Every structure is written in structure tokens, then in C-alpha cells.
Design a binder for this molecule. Structure first.
Ligand code: NA
Lengths: 218, 218
């Protein structure tokens, strides 16, 4: 019965999924892949079973729940969310969820691109220069709402939390100009099932990225 | 009052949206922004309006429909699709829709990455070496189904059509090994409203990408 979540033994793209699985009290186990160390960074464990699990578009992370085999982190989150009415009910909520689902991936991928290239320190200045405007848009989108879709928490709160928390690790002061984002993080981490998970042995906040990353590899 | 689709005067990320608006007999008009040529690629036409349209995360394309102001092309597609029950009904359809919404963006962005890269000619051979396996995944996922979510067309058929068609422009023979994908294209282009639109003066198949592209800029 327990679902299987497959991913590298890192935080990465599985962080929001792990948090949502824990928030919804879902029964799951993790299939963990380990990347080899430098200089080769072997990925054989995944690449050689990548095509042996019945996934339609093999990729990490994946979720196996009975006959349902899902890839793409956002499709995984949506699947879990539908089981728990975490998807937005009003048309307004649904639009906000769809926008943020795609926007959070853009901003995550932009950080991933800066952290996997070797000129990271050469490219980091322009990134931090353009970062406050990115966070301001999140802060203004939230405004006075408790959650990003409106009055009710949805799966995109888990995506926005991950994006925000990644950046306060990346730059510790980046949220100081945005008190409503700091309060959002405080309220998210204070949710009973989330707080219990973050204080448990399963909590895997680091490394942020794979061994292949210039930043966040450890 | 027609909806407003705003984008560059190219095919780009708006193709699937244009096709879906046409299939659904939507009332819309297009706000076309023109981009300057190299090396500056002037976008001041967009920049002078970018923050004055009510968009939460200003970006192109956008869709304005009364009070609803939407960015992210997948969010735009979902908004139009919900008006016409084109998002999938059963859980099984919804999973396939969710996977494909994100998978098609992945493959779209992977072609965009090499076509916008200055070393395009250096990178093309390996991309073409890996292309058959990518398309095989779409062919095996479709199987003998008429549409990608199952027995009824959904908005992700428009997304898959665009990615496949982009690649037969890029590599004309690339679908030859996959008859069910060729048949799918025939079915998509054989929809009455798509057929009429493709013969219309509104059809805009080229340029594939923006003026900044190395491949597909004209
Ligand atoms: Na939808």
C-alpha cells in the first residue's frame, strides 16, 4: 500500500513533494538513488533502472501509488493534492494555483541553472542583483492573504515555501525586506504535521542540489 | 468583449494557445509586440506596458479576460480549457494531462535551449542523436489512443501537437518511424476548426522563435 517516492538522496525537486506527503499524512516509502562522488559523478543506479520501472516519461522524481505511475514534480503534487482537496476550488484560486505552479518552477530552474554551471561566482552577482525584484513579486502576490491561493492552503504553498527557503539559504538576508514572506514561512513551518516532520529523522533539507552542482552540492 | 492574447509577433509559446482559442471558437484579439533586431533586440514596446497591465508576474504571453489577467502559457491554456471541459474528467485522464502539461514544456524548453545557444551548430548533432528516443516516448504513451489523455481531446493535445510539429520543422523525417504520431497530427489538423484556421490569414506558423534565436529567428 505505501506509495514509493523515487529520487536522488538529496533535497532537490522532491522537497515540496515530501512536505505535502507529510502534511496529508500519506503512507509512503522512499526509493533513494545515490550519485557517485567526484570526478565521475556516476548516475548509473538511476540511469540503468530509469527504463525498468514502467514510467511513461522516465525522470526523477517519480511517484508509484498502485497502478498510478507519475513523473514531473508538479504532476506528482497535483495527484497528491486532489486526494485532499488541496487544489483550489474557486476559479480565482485555480488561476492563482496554475500561475504559481509554473512560476515557481521557472524561478527554481533559474536558480538551478546558476548553481550547476562552473562560472557560478561569475554569474552570482547578476542573480542576487535581480533577486529582490523576484521576491517582491511573491510578496505582492501574497499581499494580506494567509496562503498563496487565498484563504485556504493549497499545494502551491509548498512550492512557494521551497523556492523561498532555497533563497534564504542562498542569501540569508533576502527576505528581510519582505515581512509577509517571513510570516508565511513561519506559519507554514508551524503547521502541526509539517513541524513534526521537520523535527524528525526523515527531514532532508540538505544538500540542496546534486553532487554535480557548484553550489548546493553538500 | 473579446479576450486579449499578448505576445511577440511570432509562433513561439503562443501557438498552442492560438490553436486552442480557435478550436473552442473563442472571441479573442491579439496584442502584438515587436522586438528589435540584434544586438540590442529592443523590447521597449513591451517594457513600456509590462507593469501596467494587472499581471501578477508580468511575462509574455499573457491573456486578459475581463478581471482575469493570466501569465504562464500553461496557466493560460488551463484557463481556456476549463471553460470547455478540456482538462480531463477521470482521475486517469487528469494524471495523463498533468504529466504531459509539464513534459511538453520540458521538451519545448530543451529545443529552445539549443536554438538560442550561440554554439547551436556545435550542439545540434547530439540533440538529433537523442531525438528519436524522445519521440518514441510520446509514441508509446499514445499507443492506439485517439488523443493523449484517452478517448477525448484535451488541451494537452494542443501542447503535444506543437512539440511534434516544431520537431518536424527542425528535422523533417523525425516522425517517419512513428506512424501513430503521424496519424495524431493528421487527426489534430483534421479537426474542422483547426483545418479552417490553418487556411486562414490569421495562421502564424513562422517564425518559430524570437529574433534572439540562432535557429528559427526568421
Ligand atoms: Na485545469
Amino acid at each position: 500500500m505505501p506509495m514509493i517516492l523515487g529520487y536522488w538522496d538529496i533535497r532537490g525537486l522532491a522537497h515540496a513533494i515530501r512536505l505535502l506527503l507529510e502534511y496529508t499524512d500519506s503512507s509512503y516509502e522512499e526509493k533513494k538513488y545515490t550519485m557517485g562522488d567526484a570526478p565521475d559523478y556516476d548516475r548509473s543506479q538511476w540511469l540503468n533502472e530509469k527504463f525498468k520501472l514502467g514510467l511513461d516519461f522516465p525522470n526523477l522524481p517519480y511517484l508509484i501509488d498502485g497502478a498510478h505511475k507519475i513523473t514531473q514534480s508538479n504532476a506528482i503534487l497535483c495527484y497528491i493534492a486532489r486526494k485532499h482537496n488541496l487544489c483550489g476550488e474557486t476559479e480565482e484560486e485555480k488561476i492563482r494555483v496554475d500561475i504559481l505552479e509554473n512560476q515557481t518552477m521557472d524561478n527554481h530552474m533559474q536558480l538551478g541553472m546558476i548553481c550547476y554551471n562552473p562560472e557560478f561566482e561569475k554569474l552570482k552577482p547578476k542573480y542576487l542583483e535581480e533577486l529582490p525584484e523576484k521576491l517582491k513579486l511573491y510578496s505582492e502576490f501574497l499581499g494580506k492573504r494567509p496562503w498563496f491561493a487565498g484563504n485556504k492552503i493549497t499545494f502551491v504553498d509548498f512550492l512557494v515555501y521551497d523556492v523561498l527557503d532555497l533563497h534564504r539559504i542562498f542569501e540569508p538576508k533576502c527576505l528581510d525586506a519582505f515581512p509577509n514572506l517571513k510570516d508565511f514561512i513561519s506559519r507554514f513551518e508551524g503547521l502541526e504535521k509539517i513541524s513534526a516532520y521537520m523535527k524528525s529523522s526523515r527531514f532532508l533539507p540538505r544538500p540542496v542540489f546534486s553532487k554535480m552542482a557548484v553550489w548546493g552540492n553538500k
